Amino acid sequence: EQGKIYIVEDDMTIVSLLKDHLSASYHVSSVSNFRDVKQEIIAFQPDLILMDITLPYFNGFYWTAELRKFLTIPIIFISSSNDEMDMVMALNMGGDDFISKPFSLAVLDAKLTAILR
Amino acid sequence: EQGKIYIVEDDMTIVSLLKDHLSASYHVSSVSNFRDVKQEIIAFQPDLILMDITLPYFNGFYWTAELRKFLTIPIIFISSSNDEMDMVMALNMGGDDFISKPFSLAVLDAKLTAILR
């Protein structure tokens, strides 16, 4: 009965890192097929999505707006240190929060805790 | 046809129409291999890029940010009339203007003339 987190990320290092860390406290799944994310989300029923918006061949901006037609669950963006994002931007893009790479797991933990309640 | 325009677009109908319309005034190229877009842009050396930011599996904002590490040329985003794209977003993501599908060719022509001036 742990909270379910779905991770949209193509970097297997990052995915492994997050699965290792978060699995103690959450049911964590990552994308299997990037062309099937709507079905994967319908089937998995996550409580929260971690959405990397820096993936070259998965348009995180497009897909967040598409998912927002259907979902009210929190979406936390994973952004780049390079990129300069803020909460106004995150909200206008359909997100609830953001965290920039490279990030501390401690900061991610605090954000996950606060948001999931 | 001296000005060079590169179009990042996977709708082949839009590419065909734009190539045909712009042929009179511009040297126009589009994507040959979506795995090699950055390299094609480096090879073609456009004066302007039309970057569709609605492609589900090519992250237009990511690639604009990558291109902005070494190009200062104008980039006009192609968006969708029902999405949340506005000028604040266009400029914040490294673009210089945007045009929303479906769009007027007269508006595109005016935008191209103005920003290539």
Residue numbers in the entry:
A (entry chain A), B (entry chain B): 4 to 120
Excerpt from the publication:
NsrR is part of the nisin resistance operon.
The structure of the NsrR-RD was determined at a resolution of 1.8 Å. The asymmetric unit contains two copies of NsrR-RD.
